[PDB]
């Protein structure tokens, strides 16, 4: 579980999105595991606009924040699931770190703000869905 709240937007994993998110849909992308829904209240999360490759992510399965080195956003194969068939997921960033299925949504942050959220994991790895290219979130 976990969301990003910037201005009149809510950013969640598309596989974890609720009925309200779909009733107030702004943009969704299956290949990125992202969904953006509109909000009534004003959100206050700063989105990072950078090329950072080091940051800190929240791990709800360990109740701890972890510093990580992460890859540049890319097309990375993800195995079949109960939400998506086997496919390349775009704008994904991998790091060495603990991830569990319910850790999806945990925020990855650098010194410049929110980078993205936990999307994939397993085998001593954690994958983050990047949100830095979505410039319309700020505007
Ligand atoms: C971080 S979740 C996790 C953790 C350890 C091991 C396995 C998983 C499962 C995983 O990688 N997922 C990928 C996600 C996707 N983007 O397609 C769909 C939901 C099922 C989540
Ligand atoms: Zn940064």
Sheet arrangement for strand 25-29: 4-13, 34-44, 25-29
Contact 57, 126 (CB under 8 A): yes
> ∠ at Cα 107 (79, 67), nearest 5°?
90
Choice from 81, 89, 116 to test ligand 1 binding pocket (greatest atom count within 8 A of CB): 81
Q: Which atom of ligand 1 sits closest to the CA of residue 92?
A: 16
Establish whether 59 is an annotated binding residue: no
Beta partners for residue 127, in sequence order: 94, 120
Burial of 11 (0-12, 13-18, 19+ CB in 10 A): buried
End-to-end CA distance of the chain: 26
Look at residues 48, 70, 50 and name the one whose alpha carbon lies nearest to residue 128. 70
Torsion of CA 61, 63, 65, 69, to 10 degrees: -20
Task: State the DSSP H helix or E strand holding residue 138, giving kind and residue range, or none if neither.
Answer: none
Q: How far is the CA of 67 from the centre of ligand 1 (A)?
A: 20
Q: Which ligand is nearest to the CA of 49?
A: 2
> Who lines ligand 1 at CB under 6 A?
15, 33, 78, 81, 83-84, 89, 99-101, 103-104, 118-122
Q: Which ligand is nearest to the CA of 100?
A: 1
Contact 98, 126 (CB under 8 A): yes
Identify the experimental approach: X-ray
Contact 20, 41 (CB under 8 A): no
Catalytic residue IDs = 15, 33, 104
Beta partners for residue 68, in sequence order: 55
Establish whether 112 is an annotated binding residue: yes
Q: Provide the residue ranges of all domains of the chain, joining segments of one domain with +.
A: 3-44, 45-139
């Amino acid at each position: 579980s976990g969301a990003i709240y910037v201005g009149n937007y809510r950013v969640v994993n598309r596989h974890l999105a609720t009925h309200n998110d779909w009733a107030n849909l702004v943009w969704e992308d299956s290949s990125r595991d992202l969904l953006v829904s509109s909000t009534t209240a004003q959100g206050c999360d700063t989105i990072a606009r950078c090329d950072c490759q080091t940051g800190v992510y929240y791990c709800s399965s360990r109740r701890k924040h972890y510093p990580v080195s992460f890859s540049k956003p890319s097309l990375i194969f993800v195995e079949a699931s109960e939400y998506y068939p086997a496919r390349y997921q775009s704008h994904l960033m991998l790091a060495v770190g603990h991830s569990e299925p319910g850790d999806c949504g945990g925020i990855l942050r650098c010194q410049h703000g929110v980078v993205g959220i936990v999307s994939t994991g397993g085998n001593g790895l954690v994958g983050f869905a990047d949100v830095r290219d979505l410039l319309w979130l700020d505007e």
